[PDB]
Design an enzyme around this catalytic site. Sequence first.
Site, mmCIF file in Angstrom:
data_model
loop_
_atom_site.group_PDB
_atom_site.id
_atom_site.type_symbol
_atom_site.label_atom_id
_atom_site.label_comp_id
_atom_site.label_asym_id
_atom_site.label_seq_id
_atom_site.Cartn_x
_atom_site.Cartn_y
_atom_site.Cartn_z
ATOM 1 N N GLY I 58 50.848 65.039 77.255
ATOM 2 C CA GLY I 58 51.865 64.522 76.351
ATOM 3 C C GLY I 58 53.051 65.456 76.213
ATOM 4 N N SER I 87 46.841 68.594 81.490
ATOM 5 C CA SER I 87 48.149 69.012 80.968
ATOM 6 C C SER I 87 47.951 69.575 79.565
ATOM 7 C CB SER I 87 49.126 67.838 81.086
ATOM 8 O OG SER I 87 50.474 68.281 81.115
ATOM 9 N N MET I 88 48.629 69.050 78.537
ATOM 10 C CA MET I 88 48.504 69.582 77.182
ATOM 11 C C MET I 88 47.055 69.644 76.719
ATOM 12 S SD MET I 88 50.336 70.941 74.864
ATOM 13 C CE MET I 88 51.844 71.823 75.253
ATOM 14 N N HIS I 112 48.974 72.244 85.557
ATOM 15 C CA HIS I 112 50.222 72.248 86.314
ATOM 16 C C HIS I 112 51.346 72.737 85.406
ATOM 17 C CE1 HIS I 112 51.423 67.828 85.137
ATOM 18 N NE2 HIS I 112 51.092 68.568 84.095
ATOM 19 N N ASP I 161 49.799 70.656 91.221
ATOM 20 C CA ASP I 161 48.658 70.160 90.459
ATOM 21 C C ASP I 161 47.375 70.827 90.936
ATOM 22 O OD1 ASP I 161 49.164 66.660 89.484
ATOM 23 O OD2 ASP I 161 50.273 68.485 89.005
HETATM 24 B B1 LIG Z 1 51.505 67.592 80.261
HETATM 25 O O1 LIG Z 1 51.772 66.433 80.914
HETATM 26 O O2 LIG Z 1 50.862 67.390 79.079
HETATM 27 C C1 LIG Z 1 52.769 68.584 80.190
HETATM 28 C C2 LIG Z 1 52.595 69.910 79.429
HETATM 29 C C3 LIG Z 1 51.842 71.048 80.122
HETATM 30 C C4 LIG Z 1 52.692 71.770 81.160
HETATM 31 C C5 LIG Z 1 51.335 72.036 79.076
HETATM 32 N N1 LIG Z 1 53.908 67.861 79.621
HETATM 33 C C6 LIG Z 1 55.207 68.071 79.905
HETATM 34 O O3 LIG Z 1 55.622 68.905 80.687
HETATM 35 C C7 LIG Z 1 56.174 67.155 79.164
HETATM 36 C C8 LIG Z 1 56.376 65.870 79.993
HETATM 37 C C9 LIG Z 1 57.158 64.872 79.198
HETATM 38 C C10 LIG Z 1 58.520 64.688 79.419
HETATM 39 C C11 LIG Z 1 59.237 63.765 78.671
HETATM 40 C C12 LIG Z 1 58.599 63.017 77.691
HETATM 41 C C13 LIG Z 1 57.241 63.194 77.463
HETATM 42 C C14 LIG Z 1 56.528 64.116 78.213
HETATM 43 N N2 LIG Z 1 57.437 67.804 78.930
HETATM 44 C C15 LIG Z 1 58.089 67.770 77.758
HETATM 45 O O4 LIG Z 1 57.699 67.199 76.757
HETATM 46 C C16 LIG Z 1 59.395 68.505 77.735
HETATM 47 C C17 LIG Z 1 60.153 68.540 76.573
HETATM 48 N N3 LIG Z 1 61.315 69.178 76.518
HETATM 49 C C18 LIG Z 1 61.726 69.779 77.622
HETATM 50 C C19 LIG Z 1 60.971 69.745 78.787
HETATM 51 N N4 LIG Z 1 59.813 69.110 78.837
#
Ligand SMILES: *[B]([O])([O])[C]([C][C]([C])[C])[N]C(=O)[C]([C]C1=[C][C]=[C][C]=[C]1)[N]C(=O)C1=[C]N=[C][C]=N1
Lengths: 182, 182, 182, 182, 182, 182, 182, 182, 182
Positions: I58, I87-88, I112, I161
Amino acid sequence: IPIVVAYDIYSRLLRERIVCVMGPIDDSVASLVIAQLLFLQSESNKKPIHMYINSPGGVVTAGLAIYDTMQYILNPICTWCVGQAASMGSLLLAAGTPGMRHSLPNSRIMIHQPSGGARGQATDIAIQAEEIMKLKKQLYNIYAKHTKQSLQVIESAMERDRYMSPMEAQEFGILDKVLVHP
Amino acid sequence: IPIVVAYDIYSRLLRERIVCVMGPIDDSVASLVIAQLLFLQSESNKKPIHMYINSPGGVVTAGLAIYDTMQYILNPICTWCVGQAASMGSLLLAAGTPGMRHSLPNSRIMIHQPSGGARGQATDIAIQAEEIMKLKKQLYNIYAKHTKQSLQVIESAMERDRYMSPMEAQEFGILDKVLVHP
Amino acid sequence: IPIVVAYDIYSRLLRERIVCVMGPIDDSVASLVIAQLLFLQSESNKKPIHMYINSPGGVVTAGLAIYDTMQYILNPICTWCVGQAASMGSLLLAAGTPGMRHSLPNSRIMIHQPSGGARGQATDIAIQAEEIMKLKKQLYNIYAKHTKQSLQVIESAMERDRYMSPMEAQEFGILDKVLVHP
Amino acid sequence: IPIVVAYDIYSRLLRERIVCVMGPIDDSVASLVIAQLLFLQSESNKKPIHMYINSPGGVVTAGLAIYDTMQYILNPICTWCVGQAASMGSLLLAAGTPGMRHSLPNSRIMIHQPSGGARGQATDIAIQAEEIMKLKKQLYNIYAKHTKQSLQVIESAMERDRYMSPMEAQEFGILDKVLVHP
Amino acid sequence: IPIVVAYDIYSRLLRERIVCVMGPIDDSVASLVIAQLLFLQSESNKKPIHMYINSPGGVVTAGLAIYDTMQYILNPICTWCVGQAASMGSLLLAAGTPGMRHSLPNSRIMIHQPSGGARGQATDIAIQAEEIMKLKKQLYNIYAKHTKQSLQVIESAMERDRYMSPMEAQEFGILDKVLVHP
Amino acid sequence: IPIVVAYDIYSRLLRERIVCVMGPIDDSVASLVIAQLLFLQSESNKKPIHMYINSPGGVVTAGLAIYDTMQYILNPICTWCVGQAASMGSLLLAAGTPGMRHSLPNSRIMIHQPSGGARGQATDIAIQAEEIMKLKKQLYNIYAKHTKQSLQVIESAMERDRYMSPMEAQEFGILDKVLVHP
Amino acid sequence: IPIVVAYDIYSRLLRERIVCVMGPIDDSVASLVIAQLLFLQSESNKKPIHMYINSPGGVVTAGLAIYDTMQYILNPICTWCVGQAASMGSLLLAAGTPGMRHSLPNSRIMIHQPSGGARGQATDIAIQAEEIMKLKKQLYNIYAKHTKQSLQVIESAMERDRYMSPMEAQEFGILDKVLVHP
Amino acid sequence: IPIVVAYDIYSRLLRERIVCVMGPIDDSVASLVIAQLLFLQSESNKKPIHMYINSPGGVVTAGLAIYDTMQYILNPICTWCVGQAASMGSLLLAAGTPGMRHSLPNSRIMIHQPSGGARGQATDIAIQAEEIMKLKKQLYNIYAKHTKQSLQVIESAMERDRYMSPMEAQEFGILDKVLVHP
Amino acid sequence: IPIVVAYDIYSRLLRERIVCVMGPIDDSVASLVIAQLLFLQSESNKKPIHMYINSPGGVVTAGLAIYDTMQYILNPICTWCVGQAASMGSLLLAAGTPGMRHSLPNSRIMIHQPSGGARGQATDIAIQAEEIMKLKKQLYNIYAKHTKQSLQVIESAMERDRYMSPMEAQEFGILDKVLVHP
Ligand SMILES: *[B]([O])([O])[C]([C][C]([C])[C])[N]C(=O)[C]([C]C1=[C][C]=[C][C]=[C]1)[N]C(=O)C1=[C]N=[C][C]=N1
Ligand SMILES: *[B]([O])([O])[C]([C][C]([C])[C])[N]C(=O)[C]([C]C1=[C][C]=[C][C]=[C]1)[N]C(=O)C1=[C]N=[C][C]=N1
Ligand SMILES: *[B]([O])([O])[C]([C][C]([C])[C])[N]C(=O)[C]([C]C1=[C][C]=[C][C]=[C]1)[N]C(=O)C1=[C]N=[C][C]=N1
Ligand SMILES: *[B]([O])([O])[C]([C][C]([C])[C])[N]C(=O)[C]([C]C1=[C][C]=[C][C]=[C]1)[N]C(=O)C1=[C]N=[C][C]=N1
Ligand SMILES: *[B]([O])([O])[C]([C][C]([C])[C])[N]C(=O)[C]([C]C1=[C][C]=[C][C]=[C]1)[N]C(=O)C1=[C]N=[C][C]=N1
Ligand SMILES: *[B]([O])([O])[C]([C][C]([C])[C])[N]C(=O)[C]([C]C1=[C][C]=[C][C]=[C]1)[N]C(=O)C1=[C]N=[C][C]=N1
Ligand SMILES: *[B]([O])([O])[C]([C][C]([C])[C])[N]C(=O)[C]([C]C1=[C][C]=[C][C]=[C]1)[N]C(=O)C1=[C]N=[C][C]=N1
Ligand SMILES: *[B]([O])([O])[C]([C][C]([C])[C])[N]C(=O)[C]([C]C1=[C][C]=[C][C]=[C]1)[N]C(=O)C1=[C]N=[C][C]=N1
Ligand SMILES: *[B]([O])([O])[C]([C][C]([C])[C])[N]C(=O)[C]([C]C1=[C][C]=[C][C]=[C]1)[N]C(=O)C1=[C]N=[C][C]=N1
């Protein structure tokens, strides 16, 4: 569109000083009709021009442009009703030179008052309502000029939609003759 | 909506004779506000009622119904501007009893003239334009009654959109007091 | 909808013999109003019932059902115009018992003739046109019964949209009293 | 489009030094008109060019390009109003050489002030508002140059929509002559 | 939403004088927050109130209404940044009472200038641009009041988007304390 | 839906042995009506049940299910026409026990023949057409049974749409009494 | 469309005095057919013209225009049914000169009454219904003229859709000959 | 498009060594312009070429291709501003040979920095941001080369949108001459 | 949702100090989880809390808010992987107290690097790219803190990934125990 080896059918007709006003009347139709009329006047300013009308109506400015161009050029103009003549069509039919307005036996003619719309602030709405009122007055004046009726009769007859057969429209003053055969 | 064990927050506020007028004003909002006002008058016709306003405007008939109901009941009414009082909202804010109209320090008030539209035949358009003109006159009369300004000043000030701060609106006559703390 | 610990505001109002007719009138609105009227008659057939009207109009059959139910029950009925009584709404306002029809000072009342449509074969179109014509006659008869005007006056006054202030509608016979305070 | 064995009607008209400006004015229309004007100047720099106008208006940059091209070439230019001339059309009609601006008897002319929009950050909005105000000043200067009215009269007459008949526009200074027949 | 036998989680939290401001800020959010604040002041005007913020921003009028309500009531207010505070959120976080503004260690704070739009005639566009410029001045004054920075520093720091960690925002004057554990 | 502290208005009416058949008739409506009828028979098999009808028609199978359930239970059934009875409604109104079918003075009744469709291969189309023809015969037999008219009269009267006032429907045999007051 | 080096197949057929009326009949089709008929009469007013019909029907005014043009010109006209002739098609097929109407052995002919619609206020609906009724009378008169049947037979046979084989249509009076080979 | 018996207007203009760059600039426009320039050089490498510009801007790669092709061929090039030269267009206007850059008196010129977007993983976003930054540096270098200004002035003047009249653009170094007549 | 007479299944589980984090993680999910955690700490600050994770990932700010709240409260926290932790989600699983992170035998874990986007002018794009770079650095620091790996290993392992079984994730340092039975 069929071709006549190389013309098209409408250009072949235009070679016989015949102009067709078919379908709804808008700016493109008006510009085409005006260009044809100017070209025909350029060819000769003494020969008659024949206009065939089958239209349900259209925009006021385009029809008034066509009417003004018809009154401007020096050629005599004959109008022929084939099918339908409603709104500007019935205004164009009555605009031909006296003694040269004809209809086919199974045609319908319709007359009524103009319609429109307004929007915006109250001042804007007042301005637009005044504009459409004076437009209605101008149209009624043209009708009274060409049908030889009185203004009161025109105002009474156009509150609602009014339909007519060729004999009724001839009695009203919109037409001169109803023709069965050449 | 949070609950208070079993009310909701708005019913708990209504227990304290507080009515909220938030968002655009339409028929549903007007009927809800009028029902609440009638119920509060049924409970007691001598206790004050507090109305909090944060609205961008709405329909003329709904706001006029709210205004008429406010002038009908015998209770004194206090009005509080939080955030925004624009168009119909600014009409309600000025309609509270004299000495009981308040605003928060960072609010905006806006006044302008009504808007609408017309459609159909020319007679229809004339009738609708006359109706909106007399509507504008009635609204101007209400504003002049409650602000103690002259009719000419009201007509001059509402040709275009006019924005005011609480001090400017207090000088105009829409408000009595600007408060920072209880 | 706010609650009164446990009612809703409209049920609390119905406990005071108050029925609300708000918004457009259709079959669901009509069935709800009729059910409330029958319940109130079941509780007591001698106490007055108060009906508040703010409506732009609606369907003919639903409004005629409401009108017939109003004329059927034995209770006296008071009607109150708040904001708007247009088309079918103006028919209900005039249907209250004589001496018990009221309006707020800034309300608008509108009267006009019914509208509809037809489709299909020529025989079907003839049948539907006959039906709508006799519907118009029935509505005009109801209006003439309750306003004490003549049929010719009703026919003349309803060719186009007609707008009215409370004093004009009181002179016409739609209302009895215009009230400012209780 | 009808053809003349092989031309089209508009190319046949262009053979007579006639240019048509019909419909809304945008970049394609402007480029076509400018190309035709340059070609006609290439053929001869001493013969008059005739421009027929029937337009509801359009974009400011395209109309200003057409106006600048008209003022650049050495040929005298006649303008003819058939139908409608609003926004840039009324600006183009008044841009013909003195003594050579004509209208048909049933045309309408309209004048008002320009419109637009702004979006983005506050600095961007300030920049765009300054740009549109300078555009308004430039347009008013052109109008005052060609109508021989004062700047105060131009600013007073263009706050709202203003409609005119050919006689009124001739009195204002937009036209020279109203013609019924050649 | 989970329930605690019978509350919901947010009403259970409100029993502990905790208000949550999450998501984008609009009129519904503002009205709910203001109602909760008024209820909590009604319960007691001497006990602290805790506000948790996780928002990306929203509308100016709603946030200014929330800010004015916070400054109006007599209770001390603590603000807690969890996750995000951008646009109005960063304005609300700095609006808590001195010594009572906290953030979690991994939060982001963002500051920038307001945005909007204009449409219509040139006069309307001028009026709207003037309104947004004075809105910007008012917001800058509030920021300068609560951060103890100078106006030039605030104007310099807000031309573009500016991002900050809790230590940077503590140095800027938006926060007092960064906490890891209770 | 208003509530009576805790019922709803329709359950409160059902406590008085009143069932409402409003709007279009489909499977959900039929299931609800049949469940209510079975419950009321379970409560008592000797007390009358009252059915109020305001419907434009619907599906044949659902209406036939309602009719069969009405003929099955032992209780006497009264039918009341309020507003409208078309297609199945007029079939349901005539299905009440003799001497117990009533209408309000301003109601409309309509009768006509059924409609449908066929699709697919020629054999399928033949099968479907045979099915709809025998459906028509069954409906005509029910009408003839309950109105005491001959089959020839029923087939003649239902080729096209037929509209009726309460007096005409009473003469036809669909109704027993037209009532103005209790 | 294949070409004959340079004609197209339809222009090559028109060189042989052959006109094709295929598909639905609307204003564009009618104008094209009328132009071709006028051109063929211009070439020679004594040679026969052949018209092939495969149409499902169309608009009344366009078909009546085609019929009137067919009756106007002096040339004898032969009609050939290939495939389908429904609505105006069957009206056009019967309009050829006596002794010159032919069909292929596997064609279908269909006759019925016209259809339409009405909308608006009750007065408008009455006017439109009157117009469609007299249109039906005119169509029936044309059919009775060309088939030599009586008016009662025509009205009886057109209440519903009626289908015919070439032998049945020859017995009815729509055709003269059914041909298998040249 | 009008024809000159047989050319089109743009081919007739190209016969006079005139190329038109109108509307937004994309790959199709760029390929057409480059093909015309190569053809004109192939005809003769010593005669001047005239380029008329009326554009709001476009894609960077297409405009850079046009610029590089203009600098490659040996012919002297004259540029003419008619109406608008914004974004990439203003880059092409300044790219003509010294002493051969002209504008009409009522044109607008606009300069600002480029825009774009990035998407994907963090590494991808870093790569794309680096690419757009060096693109900006290259564009600034071209502007500084052709206007004879310093790099600091160019970077200061292009942070926001900047609008210019022909005299201001001549002072800046984008133009040489403003012309009223040939 | 099934009920336990009167709880729901999730409230009944929360009675046993069990919180569920299922599906995508956004602001609503984060606020609900944080409210539940605060309530459980209010009930008792010494009892363990169990969190079950089945999520595909998310938004970064919501997950960081959950992580910060998890590290803030004083209670020990157990994490349970059932199904998916990507991810999160995989960041939350590793955030439990040492010795208290468990997985089921058939679960998948994925790690990732973050993703995003940029838009607008070049300066804006530079600012946003810098922001996402520091976001990536902070996330890598959290991972290195809780897995006891080096920063170089974390950077190498998250370029693309990476998928893991429970034994591989236990060896990496994300988990402590893989369990089959209680
Ligand atoms: B994962 O998919 O949960 C991942 C987090 C991990 C690296 C700890 N998520 C993201 O990288 C998200 C993807 C996303 C983008 C846009 C809307 C919803 C989700 N990135 C962000 O939320 C984000 C926010 N601000 C700047 C950059 N990335
Ligand atoms: B008829 O129906 O074509 C009729 C003309 C008759 C009275 C001579 N037409 C109109 O009145 C048209 C209808 C229309 C409205 C909008 C778009 C197209 C057609 N009216 C106008 O064109 C018009 C224009 N300006 C003001 C008012 N009405
Ligand atoms: B304001 O925006 O609240 C303003 C009232 C102010 C002058 C006291 N409202 C209006 O003028 C509204 C705008 C509107 C139009 C259509 C739908 C909803 C709102 N005008 C009307 O409601 C209205 C109604 N009848 C005629 C004319 N205008
Ligand atoms: B008014 O708007 O309330 C008005 C009634 C007035 C004359 C007492 N209503 C109608 O005339 C309605 C308009 C309408 C049409 C279609 C759907 C909804 C509303 N007419 C009818 O309901 C109607 C019904 N059957 C035939 C003709 N008209
Ligand atoms: B008229 O209505 O055509 C009028 C011109 C008159 C004042 C000489 N038109 C405009 O003012 C146009 C309206 C328009 C807006 C947007 C797209 C198309 C047309 N204005 C402009 O073109 C314009 C352009 N830039 C800034 C401001 N206005
Ligand atoms: B932020 O981006 O949330 C920011 C607030 C900060 C400067 C204190 N918001 C705005 O500036 C909003 C953006 C917005 C526009 C339109 C709808 C919703 C949000 N601006 C306004 O609300 C606004 C309102 N009136 C005039 C100008 N701007
Ligand atoms: B009436 O219009 O409601 C009428 C009934 C009357 C003759 C007793 N209705 C029908 O005839 C319905 C119309 C309909 C068709 C399709 C969906 C819903 C309603 N006919 C049928 O339901 C039907 C079903 N099966 C076969 C034929 N007709
Ligand atoms: B047939 O189905 O083509 C039939 C004609 C036959 C009776 C000689 N057509 C019509 O009756 C058409 C149907 C139609 C309606 C609307 C658009 C197109 C076709 N009727 C009319 O054209 C018509 C026109 N005005 C009034 C009434 N009917
Ligand atoms: B202007 O609008 O003509 C301007 C160029 C000026 C600075 C010399 N154009 C751009 O900056 C364009 C805008 C654009 C974006 C996307 C599609 C079309 C146009 N930029 C680019 O083309 C671009 C391409 N790659 C990277 C960045 N920007």
